[PDB]
């Protein structure tokens, strides 16, 4: 506090694609303001 | 009526195979189908197809013959035809005036009221010399040699499943259904020598009963792909909606669709730009997809015409919250007299041959959808196709 902002560090795994391909490595490197989403 | 297609395809691909295996010198044009003015003062064809016997059998063959009487009995003054396949039995019998007799005999009630309902005149000899019943080898069987022949023809392999093929037996039936005034038959060498240099997939209803589908939509696919990952690019769309079916409501599903997965994010910096071609009256499109949350740049200023600069401008973007002045692009193709400063990147085209846009570096990708939902499959919007 002083507005709040949060914070939520996170470290990478691995990338999955639509049709299911799951591949390992950090191959890309997220740009900004990309969103972020929860895992079902 | 009940409209067995796969006989007729059956028969197509017998014209094809022949027409593959022919030699120099061969002129054929095709037998017009009634399914598709009637051409020609006696020239007609029709085919009906069963293939499932663990051995011959008399009995059940009979409803397509009593079916096609009722059909001659219509209409008359012309030949018909047939193909069915059992185990072992092959080759073309004609059938006795006998046999034909016993035909007239039925012991089913489908039948006999079929009987009543055909026309009590009949000329059983000009039936006998008229109609036929053949039998012959499954169709999978047909496919697969034909894959053969084009193998033999000597075509690029990984292409000929995608393209060759699908638009090869389009081209054939282009001739059973058309009305113009041209040459009719068609020889073979000028007739591959032509196909050879055409690239544009072909869906419709023909090929969608095409046996071998499947691998068509996954190389389509996986070929996008990467022309579909990027988030900064030009796209173009141009479209004919004149042969297309049930465009007016249909049209708009896609629309949103794609502009709200390719251009709802920060990043994505060059809105794309759809063109229709015809007679089309954009306000009411307008309307509705400022009905449903959209907005649009028409391109004009006072309504007169359109400014190829305010076009292709760049739109103004804030992040939070999020807010976009212009999410898509419209505009009728007579209208737009020009070009734009950057050479597109992919420029798409749905049922249309030539435009002057073409270039060298700009990739260009050329598909013939009968429907508008395929195409969805084709660019990632839905996971199954209908």
């Known amino acids: ?40 | 009526a009940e409209y067995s297609i796969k006989g007729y395809l059956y028969q197509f691909l017998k014209y094809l195979s022949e027409i593959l295996a022919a030699g120099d010198g061969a002129r054929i044009t095709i037998e017009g189908a009634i399914e598709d003015i009637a051409a020609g003062l006696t020239t007609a064809v029709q085919c009906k197809y069963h293939e499932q016997a663990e051995k011959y059998t008399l009995g059940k063959i009979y409803k397509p013959i009593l079916l096609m009487l009722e059909h001659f009995s219509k209409n008359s003054g012309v030949s018909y035809r047939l193909f069915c396949h059992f185990p072992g039995e092959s080759g073309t019998k004609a059938l006795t005036k006998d046999d034909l007799e016993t035909v007239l005999s039925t012991k089913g009630e489908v039948l006999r009221a079929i009987v009543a309902r055909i026309d009590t005149s009949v000329d059983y000899e000009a039936f006998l010399d008229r109609f036929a019943i053949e039998f012959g080898p499954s169709a999978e069987d047909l496919q697969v040699a034909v894959l053969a022949s084009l193998k033999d023809k000597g075509f690029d392999p990984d292409d000929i499943d995608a393209v060759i093929f699908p638009n090869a037996i389009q081209r054939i039936v282009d001739l059973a259904t058309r009305s113009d005034v041209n040459d009719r038959t068609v020889e073979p060498k000028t007739f591959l020598a032509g196909l050879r240099e055409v690239r544009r997939v072909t869906f419709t209803r023909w090929t969608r009963e095409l046996a071998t589908k499947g691998r068509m939509f996954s190389s389509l696919r996986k070929s996008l792909r990467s022309c579909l990952a990027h988030n900064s690019r030009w796209r173009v769309f141009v479209i004919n909606p004149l042969t297309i079916e049930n465009f007016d409501d249909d049209i708009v599903r896609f629309i949103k669709a794609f502009v709200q997965r390719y251009s709802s994010k920060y990043l994505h910096s060059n809105p794309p730009l759809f063109m229709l071609t015809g007679d089309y009256d954009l306000s009411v499109l307008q309307k509705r997809l400022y009905d449903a949350g959209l907005r649009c740049e028409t391109g004009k200023v006072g309504g007169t015409d359109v400014i190829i600069k305010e076009l292709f401008r760049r739109p103004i973007l804030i992040r939070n919250p999020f807010r976009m002045e212009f999410s898509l692009r419209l505009a009728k193709r007579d209208e737009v007299i020009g070009g734009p400063q950057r050479r597109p990147d992919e420029l798409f085209l749905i049922n249309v041959a030539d435009d002057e846009w073409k270039h060298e570096d700009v990739n260009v990708h050329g598909f013939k959808i009968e429907r508008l939902s395929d195409l969805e499959y084709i660019l990632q919007l839905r996971s199954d196709y209908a």
């Open chain 1, 1 to 40: 506090h002083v507005n709040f902002r949060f914070q939520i560090d996170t470290q990478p795994i691995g990338t999955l694609s639509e049709d299911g391909e799951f591949s390992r490595g950090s191959h890309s490197l997220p740009v900004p303001t990309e969103y972020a989403y929860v895992t079902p």
